[model samples]
Target: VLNSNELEHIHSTNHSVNDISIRWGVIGAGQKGNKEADLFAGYKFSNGTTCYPTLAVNFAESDMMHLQNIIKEDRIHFDGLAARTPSVVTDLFDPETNPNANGYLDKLAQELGRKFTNEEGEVIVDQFLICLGAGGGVGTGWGSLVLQLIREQFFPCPVSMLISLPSGDPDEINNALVLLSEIDEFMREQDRLFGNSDIKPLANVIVNDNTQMQRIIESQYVNWKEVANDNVVSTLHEINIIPENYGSDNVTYDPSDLIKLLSIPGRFLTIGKARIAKFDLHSLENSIKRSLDEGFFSAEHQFETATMYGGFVLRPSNADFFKDVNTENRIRNTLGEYKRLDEIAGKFGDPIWDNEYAVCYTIFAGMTMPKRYISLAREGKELAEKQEQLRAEAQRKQD
Candidate 1:
């Protein structure tokens, strides 16, 4: 009793359940979102499909204008525009309350849906990389709602958010806290009003703390911005795609492994970095842990134990003598030293030394929210409630 369209839908859903294809979508939600996506989203493009970051979505005229200006100034050809309307600045409480919420979600689905499908007609977007500034109206205020809407329409795919937490700005810090708290509530589906809604919780909440990067920059005496920028691209490229020019014997970490790591049943914060360093196991360990600090863009966490899923990629020294010196065993051994059983995975590629020593990428997931952020959530929430009471009381007196 199914028409062609219905049959196709059923087949696509079935195939997705069994197939191993992975299509990634890039969404830039606000001002900060646009900038970060502009920097790293395009790298996933050019696999001979329309899977580029250029097909990004934004919400406001100011945001679209900013995108256009950046594209022209940087001479980078990217497709982005203000397709959604009226800004979420006024309605930060309930995202569905925004009049254009469905419009924005639909347009996003249409664009991302164009990324071609498999033989069985599956869209293959098993995951999405969402870029947003943590304090903006569109990014923090309404992002969780957008994510829930995506859950309503798409396959129950995982959503990974890359949040940029502003540094040294008290107002932004407060906003970040409020947003984080709301996201936490949604993840737990604790909002009584929507307790039964089929909203998919965030699979990963990755943070990029500007303050931490700034400190690392000064401490290392390097061009902080340039290094940070390069690190961002390098880290994402390694994680999202398999290197094309690696050794024949190189083992691959396919998309499923990523899904397993990122979608581990709970909220997680992911951070990673690529660095040039010595190729010994001890040195490798130090380099990876160091990169953790450089890449950890999160609020300071009080010392706490976390079950972390770690991944690493190593490119051996390009010198001919070391060409045959595969450190796969050492790399695995080093990672095992830090992670628990079934909590680690990694890969190594052909020897290459175009610039420095071996290149290494380290990723840590399944991280719990830090104590500092949790404390901030409480303070910000209570302060906002008290302030609201004051405003209401003042209005009543005037009336």
Candidate 2:
């Protein structure tokens, strides 16, 4: 809830993104949260100082220590927004394992109460995006209901989720599927305190399947363990960044439109992007097909349930990629032709890249579910069935 407007004046620096028309807050929870949040948050570590817009949250020693290591490695001391629960996991804490097994409920409420709002109780982020890996103890333990209390805390930005499903281990898959089960129920029941309940449907639930990420590791040469995270943040950066560049645009798919596509009875919104290096005559079509057919992250979208589809074409000022005007036509047509709830096709001259890459962002939303859930639900259920007999299977194989 810290005002960037005041902070910009205080710091005498424009190093803030909340000043943009649509305020975006990325909440990275659990032990795995920071890895992806770091890439998307607007804070820039410049010269000898920096500014951040959100809290650093974790409740476990390992995660708290990890937060410490990452922050100290740099020099950011976000004293107010930076937070950990008053107590890390302790022996006195519940030794139970369930989705609602969080022991720090009071501590969490205490921490969340103080930091999210400014003195006037005004929240900064117009859209709240929660990013976390689901297989872990922290997020799964509380992701069910306690997390959504913060949803009420946001007073409704229409929460958008970028959840990373684990790579299919029993424990990981169990935690993830439990979290998802609660999420679907948590979201679908979005009508009644949780509502004037003004009943705000979630904005977008974008899933990055590390179940699929494991295959990427098997299929390609890689750089880091978090190959999926790069895909998660890149598309998000463009989606979030596109609205900010409005001074130069062929058409205006303003923040209002972005907000609609994200929240309109929010469904399984999936992201697809193609980075075309050295833009060419046929490159647009090539990238379009590549982006949709083989989305960077994995989810077999149930296109039949598609309610809306839209995207922004980001290019350099020097490129005439839209000279034919067919570029725009081509994008809309391929996005699929069924009267969509909405369609957003806009173009921008991006200063970030200089004619080196022509990026095509294709986002499809309003689908009820991603087909991958079939596997998740089935696998999680199958494992749950064998819960009592795991003695035979537990040490049976490591493969």
Candidate 3:
């Protein structure tokens, strides 16, 4: 159990709310997952998102010490926790392979639930933001269990998963397809399976293309793997910023609005990005096209068919650009031209340097799992079954 002093020590000031206390607990499921979480830990957003993800926990099959050393070397300020699966487990994807799976996860949940507390040492986690590799064994085997734990134990506030799917590699691709399909089905059947109306834990499952990430950062970093992980964390950190709504007329997006918009029961999300070339109508239209295109991030389907929800952020040289009626209409119309807009919001802020890059970040929701990925999942499943048959046959001959 965490004492008040320990909680307070790791917790950053609650800048989002004055009285209501809210903090986030982050979990990294495997090696790739841990690396992604590590990048997130190293990043501190000035937009008040840092105050929430105060505690970091990682679960791995072995070599847990690698993650610990990285966290220590980075000198991140938050409290850190690590857990190692029993050495006997060779394959994490098969629960039978790990005889101690149940015991391991139960202990993991206990630690995760205990980390966030009030001054009196009671569990008070408002949300969980988990970054995991969509293709790895530990994450694949443990994904369903993690969702069940958060749903059953941490009811009400939804948990969001930032799933980083490996771009290529036959086996990893197969694993990803299998995991993604299962997660979609699992969430859809939660209410029926659990027999609980209030169990709405799995919130938004956002997919990130690792291959596209490499393309985006290859020129800048010699170690593109690190850059890919960093890009995922950096893009996600944008969710924390919510500019105040002026009135019903010019209402801005708030944290609650973001939660409500994103926490749709059985939906998955994807994000797109591009640099805003100019504020003019022509440039704006073209720029929106590039943003929605499969430029930096790959989508499961065409941006139009699956997109029912949308949001945008603009870093501009002039704050007045957002307040301008013409500019606002142009932005919305451009987005509307591609897909039917259910709900959309935007905000403007100063660029990092004087007129450096006026960037636009876009989010799309209500997409079907990409057909290509589904095919990969099926192919992967066939290979796995073949391997299992061979192993079983060898054992029979030995007997």
- Give all TM-scores, in the order shown: 0.65, 0.71, 0.70
Report, for every candidate in turn, its global Cα lDDT versus the true structure. 0.51, 0.55, 0.53
Q: Write the per-residue lDDT of candidate 3 for residues 1-399, one digit (tens) a residue.
A: 111221222234322322211244566666666666655554433344334333333342243455532344322221123332222222332367555555654555455545545557665666676767766655654565556556465433667777777666556776677667777786667536543224256766777776666765754327777656655555555434322211122434445545544555335666665556565667766776765655545644445544245455444334456556787677777776756454433232222212323556566655556554665566666767888898999999999
Model 3, position 299: C-alpha lDDT score: 49
Candidate 1, pairs of clashing residues = 209-297
Candidate 2 lDDT trough over 10 residues, lowest sum: 83-92
- Kindly report which residue stretches of model 3 are placed more than 4 angstroms away from their true locations once superposed: 1-23, 45-62, 66-102, 119-122, 150-156, 190-199, 218-221, 242-251, 302-308, 315-326, 342-357, 375-399
Per candidate, the number of residue pairs that clash is: 1, 4, 1
| Worst lDDT 10-window in candidate 3 | 1-10
Best by TM-score: 2
**lDDT (C-alpha) at residue 12 in model 3:** 43
For candidate 2, the per-residue lDDT at 175 reads: 66
**Over the stretch 282-345, how does candidate 2's per-residue lDDT look in tens digits?**
6667766766656556566676676666666655556666534676555556554422324433
Q: Judge candidate 3 against the unseen true structure and give its global Cα lDDT, from 0 to 1.
A: 0.53
